[PDB]
Amino acid sequence: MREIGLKVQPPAEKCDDPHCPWHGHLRIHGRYFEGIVVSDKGKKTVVVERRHYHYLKKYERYELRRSKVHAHNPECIDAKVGDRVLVAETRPISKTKSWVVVAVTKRAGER
Amino acid sequence: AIWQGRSLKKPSGGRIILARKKRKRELGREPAFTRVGEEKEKKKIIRTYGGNRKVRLIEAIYANVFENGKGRKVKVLGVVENPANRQYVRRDIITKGAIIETEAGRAIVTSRPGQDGVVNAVLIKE
Amino acid sequence: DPKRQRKKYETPSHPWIKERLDRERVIMRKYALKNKKELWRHETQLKEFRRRARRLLAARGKQAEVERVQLLQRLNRLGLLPADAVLDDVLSLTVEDVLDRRLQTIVYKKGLARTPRQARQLIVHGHIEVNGQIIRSPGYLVLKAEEDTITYSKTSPFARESHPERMVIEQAKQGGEA
Amino acid sequence: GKKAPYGEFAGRKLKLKRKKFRWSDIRYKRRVLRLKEKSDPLEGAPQAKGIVLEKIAVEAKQPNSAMRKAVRVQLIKNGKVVTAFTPGDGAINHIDEHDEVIIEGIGGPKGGSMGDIPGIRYKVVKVNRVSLKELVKGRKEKPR
Amino acid sequence: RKGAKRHLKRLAAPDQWYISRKRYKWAVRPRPGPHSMKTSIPLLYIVRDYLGYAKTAREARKILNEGRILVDGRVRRDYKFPVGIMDVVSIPETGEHYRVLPNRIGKLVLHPISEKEANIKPLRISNKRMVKGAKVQLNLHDGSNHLVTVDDKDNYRTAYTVLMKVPDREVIEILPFDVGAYVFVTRGKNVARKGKIVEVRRFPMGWPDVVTIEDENGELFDTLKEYAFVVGKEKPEISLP
RNA sequence: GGUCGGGUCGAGUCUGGGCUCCGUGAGGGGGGAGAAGUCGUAACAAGGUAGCCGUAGGGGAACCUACGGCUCGAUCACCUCC
RNA sequence: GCCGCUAUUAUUGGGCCUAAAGCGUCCGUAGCCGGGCCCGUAAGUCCCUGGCGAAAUCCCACGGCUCAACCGUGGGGCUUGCU
RNA sequence: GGACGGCUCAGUAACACGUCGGUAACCUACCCUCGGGAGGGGGAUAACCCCGGGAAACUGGGGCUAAUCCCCCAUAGGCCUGAGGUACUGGAAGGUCCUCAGGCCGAAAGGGGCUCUGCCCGCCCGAGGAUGGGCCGGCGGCCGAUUAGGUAGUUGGUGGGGUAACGGCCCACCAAGCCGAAGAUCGGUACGGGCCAUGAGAGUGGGAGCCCGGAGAUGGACACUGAGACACGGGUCCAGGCCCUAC
Ligand SMILES: [Mg+2]
Ligand SMILES: [Mg+2]
Ligand SMILES: [Mg+2]
Ligand SMILES: [Mg+2]
Ligand SMILES: [Mg+2]
Ligand SMILES: [Mg+2]
Ligand SMILES: [Mg+2]
Ligand SMILES: [Mg+2]
Ligand SMILES: [Mg+2]
Ligand SMILES: [Mg+2]
């Protein structure tokens, strides 16, 4: 089983589209982060949200900034709304999708 | 369709106003409709970015068909079952995912005859 | 959005303060200055020294130690401070010390000119050498090592001891505060 | 109470309120909406050229008693009539009709009127390409 | 806009040239060639500015076309030719050889050397293709290419160094990238620094590997493996600074 | 290369429907200064009907009346807190 | 005309009984602020280190045009930073 | 070779710019290195000569000739597909390489010069590099709510076509997504930055001149050639204006 460049557990089942990194021919390159899923409606398409804090030099304070990313979701990793997914950058898959989910830590409960 | 640049709409739905005119390098070309010909296989040659070369097939005859590493030139008869479009089976147009009735039977295409100028196909076991 | 060469003198915040006016009038007569511009130029020199010294008091090492050393050795070289000096002494310095390091003033001293105004004319008409070099800028700040090499030019009538004005100037051999 | 948002993670709302009340600042508003540029007949300029239409006189406010001389002037860049004050003593006599005249601001506090002249915002500076100060002090006679 | 760049403004020039950026408007735009723009300087600047054998480019071009300057044993007549790190610039008429190496400030300098070392050029291997004929093409940091065979393909690895006899191009003295290997840095913050390798870290994805290096005075500093150039097994053996 | 067509990117040209923008401009509105003027005397002292808010109606005009409120109300007579 | 003056836009650092200014009063969504102890994580935060953030411009010293301005050598900083 | 340089800042609130990264999703003439090759034929036409036409701009016919001009053939090579081997690099192989199949496309100037039997400058192919770009992404930087819902190829998917290349870029068929009160959409203003001015600083303001990037060449639209242009000193049309004319 292949060993895509960032050490994390692969899925259990091995049947997917060619747009899966592990079982297909899709490649990943560049940056990777963990994020929270906020939509899982589209077929093989989720929305992942980050939450970083931005410093304001003048007011000497911080503000939150949310950023969505629009990743690809292979059926082997059917991440749902709530799950802390790991996402990585790849080629364009669509107009908005240039990222792919690779791994999950599930979340049945949230706050 | 000519221009293959960016779309004039943001995912939000908003409008884009092109800040620049359209460049020669972000255009396209009229598509090949690789149909079945009676004979005299027809092709044209495209000069492309870099002075590179594409072979665009317009009328195919032969369709090199493959089974398990063995090939043969087997005289296309017609087109069946194009998932890309039903008008294509009507017009008898070949594409990459198409199915073709041939000598030696049915074969699923694997090539892009608008790009490589050849029809390569794979025997379906039945 | 480019460089735009800026003045190297600062003008006062108010133009008509009686205190500043009196003080500057006295300095300008004592040192024979054409311009408040010239005076303010030397004041600004001093101010920049002082600001550097301030920053380096309120600074930390490996750099701002280099610049401490550089400031002190520059001022030593100019003759404003002794070699055993400190930033405290920088802050003690004065525009009068700067003006005393002008060439016009050192030539009024070194018994070469008899008057700061005549010193100015000697410099400008080309009768003063500093280390063999003719200088015509009376605002030139002399280095403490170049000070002892100041002399009339070789191509100067004043270098002929028979010259009348040379004879007068040496009739009054004087120096000290200038 | 202690002012609005002072929290470490409140910079957004803080920035917002400062903007909201900058709009109560009238200088900022004029600068940012460009109201002067919209209502200025000089079209954002320090000077302007105009044709003298007529010569008039204006009464000083209340306590002062005098007839300040002036001219109604048609500006060329827009065709607009403004009134301009002619400093000096015989300036209105040195000036004639259909004459080209240069139009400065009169000074005055908010780019506005000055002194006992209630409603005049502009000065005459040149008359047929000659300074009115020199015309008044005698030198540099007028071309036309 | 419509195509490529044929010019270079002397302010927009590389930071590693010793160029006098405000004296004129233009600089020599280097040709494509052995090295990169970040690790090169043109031969005109070497002939005119560094060595001072010409005050003028016409004189320099006359020299270069006469053929008095070699670069790795080969005559180079183009004034835009790139001369790069660890390159040997020879003038036989004067009996001089220089190694183009970087400074600690990060700029390129000429270190004087003699004939023996001047017939040597160390080459970081930097890649390894399999080419037709089932042969191995080593793709070296001077943009050079050397063909070897599937017998010593394993003696040849990517970050290794090869000493090369340059007017003939015969490999001598492969120097491997290992612990204890003497190394010379070429770019970065720790530029003209040298020592023995201590450690290598890998960093999963496309993040470059990093090497920890020990200098002569016992200090211990890191840089990139790609910027770590091997010059020896235990001693630099190429007379660096 | 023409001449017929059949497809395409296609500016433009006619037009009808909307939507604003600009240059003007009758005729009504109020606003701001000023000039002395005209009618009165609303307000400030209990300003000669205490004043003001809200709503409503009325009136040459300031204004008046009603219902509810306020003291940013004066005076003298009570009890109380001081 | 811009900055300053102007703590007349106020994070530093302004005010809201009578001077401009507390919603008529309450309830509550987002947001912001949040009691005490223990354990963990180590996201912010801090330290150290690698790679980048062009040159010019800015500061400093030293040198060359008479000094200077200007130019060069070198040190530092700058780029909101990102990694 | 003319696609650089040079000019300007209309447009543009955008991956345009800055910065970090990516391209295993791409092109690259000139240049470098390596490895190889240059075989066999053929043809035309300027210049020139005869005659001109036209107001000009421009342009015709016939004759003659060459080439590092053009064409052909084969050999190399290139591209596609299928099968399997696992030698290479990489963080990771739809990549490279090896063997085999079926096909399509398909080079070259052994030219010129010298001190000529050797040297110099050169032609073609392949592998890489370099140079210069294309495209993607994260972060980052105005105003307005007297602009609150917007979007209909619009968001995604399956299959394709097209492109140098990924991509709703386009198409056919499936679904109902996407953005938004942390302010979408719309409107307004504006080339972006490095920088500059000011000020004790915090900050406020500007972003013509130098560099970097971008865009544009009367407005609008479209193409040819070339490695590269949809081309400021090249082409075509419309609109608008002007000039010469034998109209
Ligand atoms: Mg009353
Ligand atoms: Mg009354
Ligand atoms: Mg009353
Ligand atoms: Mg009544
Ligand atoms: Mg105010
Ligand atoms: Mg206040
Ligand atoms: Mg810099
Ligand atoms: Mg052929
Ligand atoms: Mg504009
Ligand atoms: Mg023009």
UniProtKB/TrEMBL annotation, chain A:
It holds the Pfam family Ribosomal_S17. GO terms for biological process: translation. InterPro entries: NA-bd_OB-fold, Ribosomal_uS17, Ribosomal_uS17_arc/euk, Ribosomal_uS17_archaeal, Ribosomal_uS17_CS. Keywords: Ribonucleoprotein, Ribosomal protein, RNA-binding, rRNA-binding. GO terms for molecular function: rRNA binding; structural constituent of ribosome. GO terms for cellular component: cytosolic small ribosomal subunit. The keyword rRNA-binding applies. The keyword Ribosomal protein applies. Belongs to the universal ribosomal protein uS17 family. One of the primary rRNA binding proteins, it binds specifically to the 5'-end of 16S ribosomal RNA. Part of the 30S ribosomal subunit. This is Small ribosomal subunit protein uS17. It comes from Thermococcus celer Vu 13 = JCM 8558.
From TrEMBL, chain B:
GO terms for biological process: translation. PROSITE patterns: RIBOSOMAL_S8E. Keywords: Ribonucleoprotein, Ribosomal protein. PANTHER family: 40S RIBOSOMAL PROTEIN S8. This is Small ribosomal subunit protein eS8. The lineage of its organism: Archaea, Methanobacteriati, Methanobacteriota, Thermococci, Thermococcales. Part of the 30S ribosomal subunit. The gene is rps8e. Pfam families: Ribosomal_S8e (PF01201). One of its GO terms (cellular component) is ribonucleoprotein complex. GO terms for molecular function: structural constituent of ribosome. Belongs to the eukaryotic ribosomal protein eS8 family. InterPro entries: Ribosomal_eS8, Ribosomal_eS8_CS, Ribosomal_protein_eS8_arc, Ribosomal_Se8/biogenesis_NSA2.
UniProtKB/TrEMBL annotation, chain C:
The keyword Chloroplast does not apply. Residues 101-163 form the RNA-binding S4 domain. Keywords: Ribonucleoprotein, Ribosomal protein, RNA-binding, rRNA-binding. Coiled coil: none annotated. GO terms for molecular function: rRNA binding; structural constituent of ribosome. One of its GO terms (biological process) is ribosomal small subunit biogenesis. GO terms for cellular component: small ribosomal subunit. Pfam families: S4. Belongs to the universal ribosomal protein uS4 family. PANTHER family: 30S 40S RIBOSOMAL PROTEIN (PTHR11831), 40S RIBOSOMAL PROTEIN S9 (PTHR11831:SF5). This is Small ribosomal subunit protein uS4. It comes from Thermococcus celer Vu 13 = JCM 8558.
Automatic annotation (TrEMBL), chain D:
Keywords: Ribonucleoprotein, Ribosomal protein, RNA-binding, rRNA-binding. InterPro entries: NA-bd_OB-fold, Ribosomal_uS12, Ribosomal_uS12_arc, Ribosomal_uS12_bac, Ribosomal_uS12_euk/arc. One of its GO terms (cellular component) is small ribosomal subunit. SUPFAM superfamilies: Nucleic acid-binding proteins. It holds the Pfam family Ribosom_S12_S23. GO terms for biological process: translation. GO terms for molecular function: rRNA binding; structural constituent of ribosome. With S4 and S5 plays an important role in translational accuracy. Located at the interface of the 30S and 50S subunits. Part of the 30S ribosomal subunit. PANTHER family: 30S RIBOSOMAL PROTEIN S12 FAMILY MEMBER. Belongs to the universal ribosomal protein uS12 family. This is Small ribosomal subunit protein uS12. It comes from Thermococcus celer Vu 13 = JCM 8558. The gene is rps12.
